[PDB]
PDB file of C-alpha atoms and ligand atoms in Angstrom:
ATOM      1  CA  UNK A   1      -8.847 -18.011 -22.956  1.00  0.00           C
ATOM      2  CA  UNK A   2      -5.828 -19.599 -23.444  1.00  0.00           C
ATOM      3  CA  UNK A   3      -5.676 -23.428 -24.582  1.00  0.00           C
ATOM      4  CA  UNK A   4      -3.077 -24.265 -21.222  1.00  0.00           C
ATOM      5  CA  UNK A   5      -2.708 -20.856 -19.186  1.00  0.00           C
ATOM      6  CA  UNK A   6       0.937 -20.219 -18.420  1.00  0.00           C
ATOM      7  CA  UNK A   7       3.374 -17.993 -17.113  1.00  0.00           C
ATOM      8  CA  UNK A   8       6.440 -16.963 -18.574  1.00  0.00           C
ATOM      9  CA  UNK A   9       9.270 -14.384 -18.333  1.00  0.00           C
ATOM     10  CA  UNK A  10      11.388 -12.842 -20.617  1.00  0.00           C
ATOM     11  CA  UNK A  11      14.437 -10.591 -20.862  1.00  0.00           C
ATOM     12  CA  UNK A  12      13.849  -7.739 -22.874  1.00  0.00           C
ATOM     13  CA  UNK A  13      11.312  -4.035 -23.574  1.00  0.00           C
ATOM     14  CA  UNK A  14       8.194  -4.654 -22.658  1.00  0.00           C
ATOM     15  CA  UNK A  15       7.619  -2.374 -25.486  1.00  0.00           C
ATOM     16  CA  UNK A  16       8.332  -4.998 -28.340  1.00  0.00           C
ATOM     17  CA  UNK A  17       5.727  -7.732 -26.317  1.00  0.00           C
ATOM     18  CA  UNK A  18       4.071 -10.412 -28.541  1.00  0.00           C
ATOM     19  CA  UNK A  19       1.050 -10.280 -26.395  1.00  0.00           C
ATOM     20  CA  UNK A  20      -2.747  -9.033 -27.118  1.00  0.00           C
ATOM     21  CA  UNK A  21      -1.722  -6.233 -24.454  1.00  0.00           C
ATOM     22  CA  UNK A  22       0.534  -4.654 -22.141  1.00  0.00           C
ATOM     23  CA  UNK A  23       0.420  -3.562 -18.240  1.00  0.00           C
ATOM     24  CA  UNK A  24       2.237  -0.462 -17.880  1.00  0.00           C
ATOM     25  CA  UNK A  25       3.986   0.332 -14.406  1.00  0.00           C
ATOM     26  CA  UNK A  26       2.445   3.707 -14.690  1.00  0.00           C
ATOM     27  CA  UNK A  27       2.529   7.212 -12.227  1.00  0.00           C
ATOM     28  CA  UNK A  28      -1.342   7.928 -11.288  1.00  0.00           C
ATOM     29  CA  UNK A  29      -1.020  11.308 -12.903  1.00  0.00           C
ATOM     30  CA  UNK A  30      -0.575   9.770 -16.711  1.00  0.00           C
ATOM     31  CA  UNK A  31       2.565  11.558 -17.461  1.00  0.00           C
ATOM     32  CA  UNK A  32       5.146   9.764 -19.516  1.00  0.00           C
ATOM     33  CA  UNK A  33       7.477   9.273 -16.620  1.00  0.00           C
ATOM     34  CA  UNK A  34      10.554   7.330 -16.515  1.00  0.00           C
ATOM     35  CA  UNK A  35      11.810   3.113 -17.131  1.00  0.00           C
ATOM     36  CA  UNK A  36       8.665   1.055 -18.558  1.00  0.00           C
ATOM     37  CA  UNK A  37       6.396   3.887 -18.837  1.00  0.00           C
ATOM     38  CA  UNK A  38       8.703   6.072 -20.931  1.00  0.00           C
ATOM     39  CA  UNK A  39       9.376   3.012 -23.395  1.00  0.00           C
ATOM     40  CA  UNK A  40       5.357   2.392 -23.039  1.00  0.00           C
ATOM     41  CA  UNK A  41       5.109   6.367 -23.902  1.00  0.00           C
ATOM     42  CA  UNK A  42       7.661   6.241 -26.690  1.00  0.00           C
ATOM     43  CA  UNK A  43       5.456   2.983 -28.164  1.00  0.00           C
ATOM     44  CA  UNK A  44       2.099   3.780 -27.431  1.00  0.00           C
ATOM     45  CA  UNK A  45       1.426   7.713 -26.711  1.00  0.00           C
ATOM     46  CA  UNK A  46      -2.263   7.853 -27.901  1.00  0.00           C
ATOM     47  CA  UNK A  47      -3.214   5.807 -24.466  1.00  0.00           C
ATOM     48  CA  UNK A  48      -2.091   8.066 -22.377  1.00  0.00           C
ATOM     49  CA  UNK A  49      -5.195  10.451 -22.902  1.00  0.00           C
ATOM     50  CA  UNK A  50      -7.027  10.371 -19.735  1.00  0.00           C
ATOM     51  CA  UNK A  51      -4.850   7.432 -18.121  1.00  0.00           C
ATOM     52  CA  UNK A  52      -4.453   9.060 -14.804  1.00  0.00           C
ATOM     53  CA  UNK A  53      -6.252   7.469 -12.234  1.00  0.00           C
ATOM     54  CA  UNK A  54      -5.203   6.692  -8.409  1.00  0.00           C
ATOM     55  CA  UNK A  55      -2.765   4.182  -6.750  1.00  0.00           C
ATOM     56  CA  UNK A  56      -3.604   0.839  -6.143  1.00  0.00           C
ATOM     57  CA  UNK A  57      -5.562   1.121  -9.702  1.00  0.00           C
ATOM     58  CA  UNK A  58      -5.751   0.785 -13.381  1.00  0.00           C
ATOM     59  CA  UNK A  59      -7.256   2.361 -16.138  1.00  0.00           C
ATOM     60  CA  UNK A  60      -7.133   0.998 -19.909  1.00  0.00           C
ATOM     61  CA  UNK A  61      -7.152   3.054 -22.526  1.00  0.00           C
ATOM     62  CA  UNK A  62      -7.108   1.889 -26.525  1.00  0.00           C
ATOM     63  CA  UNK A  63      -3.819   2.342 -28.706  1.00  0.00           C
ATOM     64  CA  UNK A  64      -5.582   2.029 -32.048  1.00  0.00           C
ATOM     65  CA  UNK A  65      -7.272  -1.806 -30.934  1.00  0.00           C
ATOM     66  CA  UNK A  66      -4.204  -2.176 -28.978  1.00  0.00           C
ATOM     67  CA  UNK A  67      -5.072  -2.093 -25.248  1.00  0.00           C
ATOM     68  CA  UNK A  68      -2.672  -0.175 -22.485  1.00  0.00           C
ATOM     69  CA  UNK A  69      -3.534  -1.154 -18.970  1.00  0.00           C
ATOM     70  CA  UNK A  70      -1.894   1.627 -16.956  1.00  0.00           C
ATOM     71  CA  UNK A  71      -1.529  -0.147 -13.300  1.00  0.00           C
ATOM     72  CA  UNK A  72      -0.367   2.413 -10.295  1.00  0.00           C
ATOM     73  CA  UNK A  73       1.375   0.688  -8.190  1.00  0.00           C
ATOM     74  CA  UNK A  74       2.459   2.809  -4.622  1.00  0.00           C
ATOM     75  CA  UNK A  75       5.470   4.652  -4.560  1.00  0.00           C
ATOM     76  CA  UNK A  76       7.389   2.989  -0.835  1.00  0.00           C
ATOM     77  CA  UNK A  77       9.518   5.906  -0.828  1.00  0.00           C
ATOM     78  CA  UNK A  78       6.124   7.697   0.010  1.00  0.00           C
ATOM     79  CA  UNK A  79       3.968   4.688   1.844  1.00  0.00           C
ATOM     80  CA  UNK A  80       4.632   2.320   5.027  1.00  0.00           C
ATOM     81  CA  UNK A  81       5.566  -0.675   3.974  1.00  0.00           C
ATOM     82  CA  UNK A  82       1.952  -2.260   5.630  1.00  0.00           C
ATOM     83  CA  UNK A  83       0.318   0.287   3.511  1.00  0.00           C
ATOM     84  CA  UNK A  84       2.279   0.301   0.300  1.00  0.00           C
ATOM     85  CA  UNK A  85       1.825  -4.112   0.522  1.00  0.00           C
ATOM     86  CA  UNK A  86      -1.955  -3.609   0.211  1.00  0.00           C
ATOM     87  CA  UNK A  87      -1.919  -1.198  -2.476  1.00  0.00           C
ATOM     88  CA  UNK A  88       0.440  -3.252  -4.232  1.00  0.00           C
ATOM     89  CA  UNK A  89      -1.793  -6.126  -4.044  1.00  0.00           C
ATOM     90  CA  UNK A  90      -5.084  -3.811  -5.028  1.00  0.00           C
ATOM     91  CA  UNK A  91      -3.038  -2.881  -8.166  1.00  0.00           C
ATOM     92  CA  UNK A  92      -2.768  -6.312  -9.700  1.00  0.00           C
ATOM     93  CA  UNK A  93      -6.054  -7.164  -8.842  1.00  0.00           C
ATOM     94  CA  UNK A  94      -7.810  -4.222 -10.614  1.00  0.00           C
ATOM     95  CA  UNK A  95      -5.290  -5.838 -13.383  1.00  0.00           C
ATOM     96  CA  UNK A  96      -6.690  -9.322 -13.154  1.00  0.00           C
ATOM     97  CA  UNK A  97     -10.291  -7.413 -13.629  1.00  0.00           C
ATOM     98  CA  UNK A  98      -9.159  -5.815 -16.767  1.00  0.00           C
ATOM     99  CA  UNK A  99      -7.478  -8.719 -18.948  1.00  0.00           C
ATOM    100  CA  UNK A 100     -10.626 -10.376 -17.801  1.00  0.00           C
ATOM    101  CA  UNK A 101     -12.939  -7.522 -19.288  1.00  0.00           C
ATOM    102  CA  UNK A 102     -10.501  -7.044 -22.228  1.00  0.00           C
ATOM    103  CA  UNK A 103     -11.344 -10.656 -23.358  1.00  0.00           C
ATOM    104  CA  UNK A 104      -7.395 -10.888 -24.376  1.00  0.00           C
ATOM    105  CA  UNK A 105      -5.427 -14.862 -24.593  1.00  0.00           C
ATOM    106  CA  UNK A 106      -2.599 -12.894 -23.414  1.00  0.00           C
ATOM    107  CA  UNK A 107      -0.829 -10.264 -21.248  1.00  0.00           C
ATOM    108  CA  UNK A 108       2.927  -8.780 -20.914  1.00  0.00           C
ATOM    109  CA  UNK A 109       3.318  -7.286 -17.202  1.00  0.00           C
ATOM    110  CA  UNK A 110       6.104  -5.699 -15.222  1.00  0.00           C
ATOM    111  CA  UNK A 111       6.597  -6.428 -11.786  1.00  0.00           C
ATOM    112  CA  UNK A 112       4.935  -3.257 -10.382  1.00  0.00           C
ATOM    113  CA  UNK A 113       6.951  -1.371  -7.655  1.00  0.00           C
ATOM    114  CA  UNK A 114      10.438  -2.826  -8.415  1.00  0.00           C
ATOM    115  CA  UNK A 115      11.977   0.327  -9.851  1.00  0.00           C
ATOM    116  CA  UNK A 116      12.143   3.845  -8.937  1.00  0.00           C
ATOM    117  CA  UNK A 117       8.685   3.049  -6.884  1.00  0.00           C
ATOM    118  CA  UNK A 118      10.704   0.373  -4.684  1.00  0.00           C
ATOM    119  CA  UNK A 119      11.526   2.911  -1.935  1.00  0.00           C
ATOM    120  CA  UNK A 120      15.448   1.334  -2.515  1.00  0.00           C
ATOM    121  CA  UNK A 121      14.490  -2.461  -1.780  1.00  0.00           C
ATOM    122  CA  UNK A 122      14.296  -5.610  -3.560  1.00  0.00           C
ATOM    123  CA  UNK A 123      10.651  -6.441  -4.021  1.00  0.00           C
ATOM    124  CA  UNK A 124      11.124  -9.530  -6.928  1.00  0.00           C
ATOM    125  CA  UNK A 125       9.169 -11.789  -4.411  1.00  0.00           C
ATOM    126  CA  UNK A 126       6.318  -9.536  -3.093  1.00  0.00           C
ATOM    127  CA  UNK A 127       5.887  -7.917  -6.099  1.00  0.00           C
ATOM    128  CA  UNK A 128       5.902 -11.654  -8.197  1.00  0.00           C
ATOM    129  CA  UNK A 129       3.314 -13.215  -5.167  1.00  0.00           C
ATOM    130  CA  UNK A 130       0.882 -10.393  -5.478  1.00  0.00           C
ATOM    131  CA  UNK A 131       0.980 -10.931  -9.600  1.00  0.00           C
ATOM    132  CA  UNK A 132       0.281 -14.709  -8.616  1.00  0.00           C
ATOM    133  CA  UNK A 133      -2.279 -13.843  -6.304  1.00  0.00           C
ATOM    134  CA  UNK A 134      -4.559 -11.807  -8.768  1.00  0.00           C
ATOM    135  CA  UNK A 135      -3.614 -13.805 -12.288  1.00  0.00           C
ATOM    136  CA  UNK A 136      -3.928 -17.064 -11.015  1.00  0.00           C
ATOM    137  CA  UNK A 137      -7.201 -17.146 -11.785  1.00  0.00           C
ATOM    138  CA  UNK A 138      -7.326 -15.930 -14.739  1.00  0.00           C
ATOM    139  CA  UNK A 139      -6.681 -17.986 -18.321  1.00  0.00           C
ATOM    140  CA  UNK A 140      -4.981 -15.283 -20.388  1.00  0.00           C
ATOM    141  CA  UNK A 141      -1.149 -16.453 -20.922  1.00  0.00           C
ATOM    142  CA  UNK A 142       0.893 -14.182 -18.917  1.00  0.00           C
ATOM    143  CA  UNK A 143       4.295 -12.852 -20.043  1.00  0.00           C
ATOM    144  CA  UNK A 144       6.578 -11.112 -17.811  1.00  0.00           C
ATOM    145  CA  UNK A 145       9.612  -8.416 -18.662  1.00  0.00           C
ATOM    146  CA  UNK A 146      12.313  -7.665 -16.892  1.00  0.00           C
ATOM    147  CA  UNK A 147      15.466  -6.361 -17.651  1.00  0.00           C
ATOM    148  CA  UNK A 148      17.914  -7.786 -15.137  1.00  0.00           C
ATOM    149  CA  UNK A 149      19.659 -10.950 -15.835  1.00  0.00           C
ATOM    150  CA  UNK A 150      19.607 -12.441 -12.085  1.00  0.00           C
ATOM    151  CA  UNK A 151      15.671 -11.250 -12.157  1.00  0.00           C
ATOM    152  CA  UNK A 152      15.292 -13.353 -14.917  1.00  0.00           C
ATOM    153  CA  UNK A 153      16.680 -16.441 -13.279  1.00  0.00           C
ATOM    154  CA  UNK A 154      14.798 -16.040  -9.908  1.00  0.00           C
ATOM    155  CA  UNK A 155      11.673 -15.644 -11.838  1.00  0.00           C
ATOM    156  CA  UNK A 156      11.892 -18.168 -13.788  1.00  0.00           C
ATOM    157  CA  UNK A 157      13.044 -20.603 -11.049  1.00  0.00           C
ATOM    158  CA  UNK A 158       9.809 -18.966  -8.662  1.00  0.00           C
ATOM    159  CA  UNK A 159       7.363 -20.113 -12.183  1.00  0.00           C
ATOM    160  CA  UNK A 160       8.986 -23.328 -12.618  1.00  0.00           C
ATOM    161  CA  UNK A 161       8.348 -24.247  -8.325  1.00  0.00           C
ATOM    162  CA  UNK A 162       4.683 -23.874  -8.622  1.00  0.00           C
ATOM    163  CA  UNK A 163       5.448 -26.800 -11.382  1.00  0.00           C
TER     164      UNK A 163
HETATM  165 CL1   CL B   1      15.163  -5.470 -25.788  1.00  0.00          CL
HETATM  166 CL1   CL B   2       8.557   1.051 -10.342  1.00  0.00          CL
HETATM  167 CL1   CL B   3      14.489  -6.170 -13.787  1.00  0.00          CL
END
C-alpha cells in the first residue's frame, strides 16, 4: 500500500504515467480504438492479446511486468442513461478489484465514459463519483489524466473538497 493514499490529477498522456500501472478506457472487443486506448495501443500493444471482455468490466493483461487494466466502460450513445450509470459504476469497481489483486502502490486512470463513450454529455462528476466510490477503499495512490485544462481545475478542486 501506499504510506498516505492520495488522489491526484494531472494534465498530460496517460501513456507517459509514473505509476506501477495504467487503466485503459478500453472498447470490450480489444481493438486499438481511438483517444486513451490508441495512445495505450501505441505504448503498450503486447496487452492487448486477449483483452476483450464485456462492458461494465476489466481484464488485465501483462506488458512485459507492466500491468494494463483494460476497463469497459458503456458506450451512452448506445445505453439509457439508468443503465449506462450502473455499468459505469460496475466498471470501476471490477477496477478497484484489480489494483487490489495486482498488489500495485499506485494507479493512473482516465475518467471512463467522458469521451467518444459520453453519448455527447459532460460526465466529469459522475464519472469522478463512481472512481471515488470504488477507489476509496483502496490504498494504492491514484493518479488521474486528463487532457482538458478546465477538467483539470474541476478535478482538482472536487479532490481538494473531500480535504
Ligand atoms: Cl503530454
Ligand atoms: Cl470514452
Ligand atoms: Cl479531459
Amino acid at each position: 500500500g501506499a504510506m498516505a493514499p492520495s488522489y491526484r490529477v494531472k494534465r498530460m498522456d496517460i501513456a507517459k504515467n509514473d505509476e506501477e500501472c495504467v487503466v485503459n478506457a478500453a472498447n470490450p472487443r480489444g481493438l486499438p480504438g481511438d483517444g486513451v486506448c490508441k495512445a495505450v495501443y501505441k505504448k503498450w500493444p503486447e496487452s492487448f492479446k486477449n483483452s476483450a471482455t464485456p462492458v461494465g468490466t476489466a481484464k488485465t493483461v501483462m506488458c512485459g511486468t507492466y500491468p494494463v487494466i483494460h476497463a469497459v466502460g458503456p458506450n451512452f450513445s448506445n445505453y439509457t442513461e439508468s443503465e449506462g450509470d450502473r455499468e459505469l459504476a460496475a466498471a470501476y469497481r471490477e477496477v478497484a478489484k484489480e489494483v487490489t489483486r495486482l498488489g500495485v502502490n499506485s494507479v493512473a486512470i482516465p475518467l471512463l465514459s467522458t469521451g467518444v463513450y459520453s453519448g455527447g454529455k459532460d460526465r466529469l462528476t459522475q464519472s469522478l463519483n463512481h472512481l471515488f466510490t470504488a477507489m476509496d477503499s483502496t490504498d494504492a495512490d491514484v493518479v488521474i489524466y486528463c487532457r482538458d485544462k478546465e477538467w483539470e481545475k474541476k478535478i482538482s478542486e472536487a479532490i481538494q473538497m473531500r480535504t
